[PDB]
Symmetry: D2
Subunit: 123 residues, 4 copies
C-alpha cells in the first residue's frame, strides 16, 4: 500500500497538476488542472489503484478519469490515464492516456487522442 | 444529460457486465464483472461523464477505471475505458481501453494492453 | 503462410479500400483509399506480416503504414495499423491504428489519434 | 524533405537500434534490433514518411512496421510505430507503438500492447 506514496500533488511534463487522495480500499479522488488544451482551473477526478501490489519490485497499477466540464468551460471530452506508480527517491507515475471527445457517429473515427504523461513530485 | 440514459446495466462483446449509476454532477459509480482474464465476480468502478453534452447530435464523453483487486483475486492491474455514450433506440457506449499491469521498470515496455469494447443495453 | 489469404482487396467499416500484395518473405505492398478524412484517391502503403504463423489456430500478425501524401493532397500525417489476419469463411483483418500528424512541439500532446478498423473481403 | 535528416541510425530509450533509409518519394526501408523481448539480431522494417512536410515548424509524420520473424526467431507478432521526426541540434523521432501478437479469437482481447519510444541520433 502506497496510499501514503500516491496521495499528494503531482506534476507532468506539460506543466499540469494532479492532486489526489488515495483511500485505504483503492479509491482515488482529487482534482486535475491541465496546462494545455480546452481547459481552465480545476476539474474533478476519480479513479482506482491496487491497494495490495506485488512485493517483488513491481509498480502499483492505477487509473483515473477527468471529464473536462467544470464551472468555467465544457470541452465535451474525457481523458483516462492508465499506468503505474513507482515509489523510491524519484517517485513517478508513468501513464498512457485516452482522450475521447463527443462526436457525431460520422466523426467517431477521429474521436480519440492517445498520449503518455509522466508525473513526478517536483516541477 | 444522459444521467438517465447511462445509468443501468450494460454488456460488451466479450460477455462482460458493467453496472453504473450516473450522478447529476458527472459522477460514475458501479461495478464491473469481466467475462475474461484474471478476474472473478464484481470489481469497484468509478468515473466521470460530461453532464451537459453538445446538442448537435454528438455523443456524451465519459470514462471509468477498474482496479482488478477485490475480495477474491488481485490481478495487479487496472483498466481505464475512455469513450462516448450514444443514445437512441440502440444505445451504445463505444470505448477504447488501456489495461496497465504493475511491472518492474525492466518490463514496463510490456505493461500496457490496448483494446476496444462496445457496450449495449441487451446481450 | 497466408500469402494467398492476405493478398487482395479489403474493405473496412468506414467504406475504405485496402489493396495489398503479400510477398513470400513477409512484405506487404499496396494502396489505401480512405472513405474519410483529409484524403482523396489512392495512397502508397507498405508493411510486414508473419509469413510462418503458429498453427494452433492463432491469427497472423501484421502491420502497415500510410503517409497521407499523394499527388492530390498532403494531410501531413501517417497512420499505422497493427493487427492480425484471421482466415476461414469470413476472413478478417482486425486492427488497431495510430494516426500521427506533424505538429509543433507545443502541440505534440494532441498529435495522435487512435482507433480500430475491421477489414473484410466483402462490402 | 527530411530525407537526409531521417536516414541513418537511431537509438531509443530501451537501447534498441533502428537503421533506416528514407527515399525521395516517401519510402522508409531498413532494419530494427530490439534490446528487449522475444527478439534477437536484425529484423526487416518498412514504412512511410511525409516527404513534403509543413514549413511552419511542425514535425514530419512517419511510421513503420516490424514483423518479429527473422532467421533466428519468430515471435508471431508485429509492431507499428507512428510518430514524427523533429529536426535541429537534438533531432528526435517521437513515437507511439502498437504490438499485436497472433492469438486465438478467444484471446484477441489481450493481443495488443501499446507504448511509446523516443529515438535519438546518440546513445
Amino acid at each position: 500500500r502506497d496510499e501514503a506514496g500516491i496521495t499528494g500533488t503531482w506534476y507532468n511534463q506539460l506543466g499540469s497538476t494532479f492532486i489526489v487522495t488515495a483511500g485505504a480500499d483503492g479509491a482515488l479522488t482529487g482534482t486535475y488542472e491541465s496546462a494545455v488544451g480546452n481547459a481552465e482551473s480545476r476539474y474533478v477526478l476519480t479513479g482506482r489503484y491496487d491497494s495490495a501490489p506485488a512485493t517483488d519490485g513491481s509498480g502499483t497499477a492505477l487509473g483515473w478519469t477527468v471529464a473536462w466540464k467544470n464551472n468555467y468551460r465544457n470541452a465535451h471530452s474525457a481523458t483516462t490515464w492508465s499506468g503505474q506508480y513507482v515509489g523510491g527517491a524519484e517517485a513517478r507515475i508513468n501513464t498512457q492516456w485516452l482522450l475521447t471527445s463527443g462526436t457525431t457517429e460520422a466523426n467517431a473515427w477521429k474521436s480519440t487522442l492517445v498520449g503518455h504523461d509522466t508525473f513526478t513530485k517536483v516541477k
